[PDB]
């Protein structure tokens, strides 16, 4: 039911693309996401569960045939759980006990709101006690001069883990356990390695509250984008909205689609569930249903570890 | 100072009219300024019982209960079964507000001792039931606002957002 | 409705009050015929005269708090609380004053000497075009007053903490409320903000991308607020203050150039602008655009509830008439810039790189519809109820503006919780799932090939690598022929992918005069703008990070010219300037004329690979040191400025009280009062001070509750008989209202904000911008943007330390020799005998990234906004506060060099300035590093000084007896010294600072002297 | 699984090592070693693979394609690689010892901490599920040591007291009574507490100053002084080489990996700062 | 049901036990198991009165109190100033989840009447207090969990937890 992904060494999940030497008189550089996107985690299990007799040009019609349904990802150090929390470009790894009073916090008076929010991302933010940015710098050597090439230098801020950390997901499938278990995986990045571990864990499947946490990017179907962005306060209480690419598919070596999403760790109001349903058309509902299977539209209650969905 | 009491807004009996005392002066916390209900109060960790219509102090932060705050006093047919305390309004977690408050108020809460008669099991309860939307307005909202079903009102929004904002966790026992 | 009653407000009090009031000359009021309104009325001879009704009275009351501070009826009285000494007190501090004895028009012989100048400047505007009469007079009011060298005088001799010119502009800005409330009442405080400026700046390979993308932020916002400039004139903009904008004055001239005007009046007014708005730099006249992209970022208006389209003003239809108007006025500018770029690119359909820009400006019409900047607008409102009783002001109305601006600020911070990047508005799903993306150039072997500047959007113009370009440019659709290749390469590097937005940055980077479309706005048709650009050949070359990393090399071969010259003779180093190109960089312009050809791309030279060893040898023979590839990205930002606009005290007690403390000010009641009580008593000096000294006395521990009159009635009633004119001064109420005023001040723990408080801070913020630009030019730097408190520049690694030293002090008003036409006088910038306040108390943090010229400019700018803006937020040091040793957190000047980090506090005293003697030790640690660095390169101290400190550190840390530490550093210095006569001291107030940091991925040594060593290693690391 | 096998190995510094990292850390070192998340020296997987791939292409120039298939094919062809190196983890650093007669006398000893031994165990557990050549003879030893966590430990020697690096007095306790040592060198292995070990380890790291001399006047130049950090001789780094299932890896693991004894990692080879030795924990166990 | 009493850990003098009843059975919820305390529960919407050390109830979801769940009967001495609950597992909002619960229990928490005399004001306060932190080593937990203080997992493992886990809002009244 529950899958722990144990990184054996610093990882890198880069966004923003174009990490390779193209321009002559210039270095390259890449950062890393603190939490891997669900496309990354889906592609990892899809890599284990791969049979050539499938797909032929799909990468999600092909992917959704392998895994049943994945739920969003968070952190687990020592049996504690930490969850992404996002603000106006600030990201924090906050503990479960601090999300309870967010809806009352986001509604307080001006000065009492800022103080409460400020202390969440600075004092009660447990990210930097758990994760450090190891800014590795690499180099390409030409065997002719046996020195560095013309500006073939790159900086890659890896994801160093000060403590023991796992990424936590849940799968609807149970025939999946004895397949992806104890497996050494090439957890997406610069050829890095993590270990997989499956154990049972009972959590809710569907709930109703007035404020959810986005435990995974909530994809916006690019057709409601106008009727959604013009009135954003009706849907997102706090967090970050931006255009993201869904990744890079292996079987075709192509960058996946690029569509606006609500980044994981945002606080979405209940108004976001019905809005999506009443804006997504069945032309794409069959598509966005798959996007949910790999783990994108995953919501969490600020109460407790209860995992909802949007189209499900 | 001020005298305000709380009343929950479920779909049930015994809640028709309890306050026995209305504005008296010119004060109201909850309001209907023809843009919707403002300054709704919500209590975290409390459940309502249709039996002995009042609240019970559970210990689940999920069990929220939405009601209204108007000026008034207990029915004094009980005078005991209510909780009374003075919490500044800033301490009171409200809903889509209109303004600030006197910052020092005396609030009354319909209460029940935890009722260890049975194990608690709360469940969220809906209020669609349009025919039960009608009755609670003239039951509760009229003894505090009789102006609704009069000269001008945009009924199709105000008793529409009641179906859109209010909810709670009952006990179903 | 024709209101235009603000000129009655802009002159209701002449810039001679303090000399006419409690008279010095007292005969220029004689030699023409209430006393000061007479000289106020006489100078109003151009047009409609002064109205003794709801046109100044109520506006002048809510304009400034000098009607609450020093009483309502004795403000309008000029009587008993007299003082025949015109001091001018700072507004942030009150222990600093200037003295304003006598420079002013004293006789009508001298008085009309400037009225003929005022009139000879507005005589050229057709009398039907009153909006030009107001606009022009608005800017030149204090300019022609500074030229005719007159000392600047306070708005009131009692409370001298307000310049009369600022208070005049203040009551004219509040005039939009008073007027629109006298009519069918409605008045708004509109505010605009730009979501994610730093993220927009940080998208660019080159600096011309950084400079242009930083210029779009200013242009796109200027094109909006110029509509308000056209509709209600000036004075509807509180931030940024217009009375010193370089963007306004430039727009103001092109209005006079339009519709015709006297050629030696448009000129008569252009030496005023060049001397004061700029500083003797007519480079904009040659550039045809304002050289520096001053980024206001946060614009706040004060609008009346009156709208046009009735051919004249009416009542506003709905409240959303202002938000919607800006949102569409903002997207117009982006459209009108895509328009002009389309037109201009087809004008130059040939010449290469434009047949490319044409091919994409047409292929990606739908994408370029969306503005790439995505501002956010907010709004509050006022009514007649909140301000009037029947037709006069009500009690407690004086706090309406403060409370209204409070809600506005909150609504911004409320919305800043959700960050929506402008890329999210685009529609890219089907353009990337199916290969419908137009890719001019290579074809992505892997999908769509993200842009190299943004990183987020897919690219439209892919570029081949340096296999070879010609045979790969001309075959593909990119190049039509071969001649255009060397013109495309000139603007796009091989291998560089570009998105539609970034190519627009590159296209405007090839022609910055196209920004005139946004600069002027609704003045010239888009085609007329473009025509003057193709009717000229202005070539604006912008530096790059390789040019900045070559200053000392260029400046060395520029004075060894003839020697370095014969050997090359052919390498464009000794080429002769064949054109007359120019630049906003006031170092390239400054030389450009030493047969040195500063246009050469150093990456085909000493920074190249086919030519590295050559120019190493060339530099070798001529004792020219090979350059270092490192520059310094300096980014300044003031501390708690927006928090200061709320009247709060965090900028004073930075760290001792934090913004979070204002959720409950009673927890810091002991300190917030010690300061506020000090600010009030020192402000308002004269016979009045001993009156208020007793009003603050009878408060401290929940005192008398109006039973203080007894102590202060005696003060006032024994004073009101000093003149027999008291109409109905109910002294038992007067002293109560004053007691009511200070009560709210001390209860809220913050200054009650009025317009004059804003306009003064805003204007000073624009004057500090001027001196800040001369400093970045003096230190051979390149300004990327400098709007107000913020600043972004690229200095060489050499001039970076002394820049911070002078810039930090110049911000506080203290400073050495004048920079432009303005001097720095201990917290008072002075322009020709005219004293203006600065911001001495406001901390100003710095962030220096020493970066390789080849480092990606996206991650260098990102770090500078995630090294400070979230690293400056967590750094605490031991500050000296009122004899105690508290923990401040601001004003830190962080340094960074690829992993090494250093923090050098600039204050060490928590109220940064409390007396004029506090200035000479601001940034006092910097020259300690500057002197130390000086003695090292002269071989007077070995560089091993930085490597031996580790063993002396533990003793200097553990030692708490300062007589013992002043010997350990004296020993550590002389041990690894290379001579025997170096006596280098450390100020001895630097022994024990203990800079800490809360659980962050930044490791800072926990003591100051160690940070001084790391700062030198960082400065020296970026010179090898 | 596409990680058919895993081949852990020990990286034994024959000379001092310097794998550079720019200027990433503070202490006073201008050219510091490559660190890890908690401050110990490591060899990054990029530097360890690139050095072994730059080597071994000159050594076996005929098998360049076998190496390209496994180790990357650095050319513009971008078929996926078949072999992965994990970051080399500091296993044991040499330390000078003065023991109070306490023994058959030693002059130097191997020193580990419990933090370092957890990451080694983490690497060891992670590949036990695919290594059907199960090296539990080694994984168990770390398990018993980690059971005794919370005190200084000597594995096979019987000292009970010593002075490490002339500065730190520690009292040592046998594991339980005895256990075979991992490194077959006749040298004890001490496992110290993480606080005391981090000081003893930081004292074994070599931090030198270096000088550039004006050749005409034989004096140091201006700014011709800088500082570097080396990892001593006899230091031991532990890493794993993970291989996907293929036919090239069968050749690589049989033909190529048997003949790697000495390679050169890091920089400053002119100073002789890269000669290191791999030991392939499949025969030392 | 099991008579599981939930005891506070504030800064107060009277915190010693105030319950002369102990495990009674052999069951407990919170455990110190080679990681630190387990299954700590949070009481939100409640405060603590300095004098009369007990959990003062409120309606602010921000005010919160954290303690442990021990199976001792509520001192068998007051029977009045105690809140008595019949509650399942899923409604016990717990921290450090290791083991689930029998899912129907009976909990007593140190209670207080609202005391509507004066206006409320609840203050955030920590309990780090290194001079006091050593008291809590053997004030509350060891008297219930003596097994860990003698020949098992260290009682310094408990110290960096209570200065990390428990931090309650007080009254200062
Ligand atoms: Zn781009």
UniProtKB/TrEMBL annotation, chain A:
Tree of life domain: Archaea
Pfam families: Cas_Cmr3
Transmembrane regions listed in the UniProt entry: none
InterPro entries found in the cross-reference section: CRISPR-assoc_protein_Cmr3 (IPR019117), CRISPR-Cmr3_IIIB (IPR010165), CRISPR_assoc_ribonuclease (IPR052875)
Entry protein name: CRISPR-associated protein, Cmr3 family
Organism lineage string: Archaea, Thermoproteota, Thermoprotei, Sulfolobales, Sulfolobaceae
UniProtKB/TrEMBL annotation, chains B, E:
Lineage top rank: taxon: Archaea
Biological-process GO terms, alphabetical: CRISPR-cas system; defense response to virus
Pfam family, one: Cmr7A
Name the record gives this protein: CRISPR-associated protein Cmrx
Organism: Saccharolobus islandicus (strain REY15A) (Sulfolobus islandicus)
Taxonomic placement: Archaea, Thermoproteota, Thermoprotei, Sulfolobales, Sulfolobaceae
Automatic annotation (TrEMBL), chain C:
Record: residues binding Zn(2+) 1: 451, 454, 499, 502
Binding site for Mn(2+) 2: 195
Superkingdom of origin: Archaea
Ranges where the Cas10/Cmr2 second palm domain occurs: 752-872
Residues at which Zn(2+) 4 binds: 499
GO biological process, one term: defense response to virus
Keyword Endoplasmic reticulum: no
An example Gene Ontology molecular-function term: nucleotide binding
Sequence positions that bind Mn(2+) 1: 193-194
Stated name of the protein: CRISPR-associated protein, Cmr2 family
TrEMBL record, chain D:
UniProt keyword Cell membrane, yes or no: no
Domain of life assignment: Archaea
Positions of the CRISPR type III-associated protein domain: 11-277
Short name of one Pfam family: RAMPs
Keywords per UniProt: Antiviral defense
Claim: Oxidoreductase is one of the keywords in the record: no
UniProt GO BP: defense response to virus
PANTHER family noted in UniProt: CRISPR SYSTEM CMR SUBUNIT CMR4
Name of the protein described by the UniProt record: CRISPR-associated RAMP protein, Cmr4 family
Organism: Saccharolobus islandicus (strain REY15A)
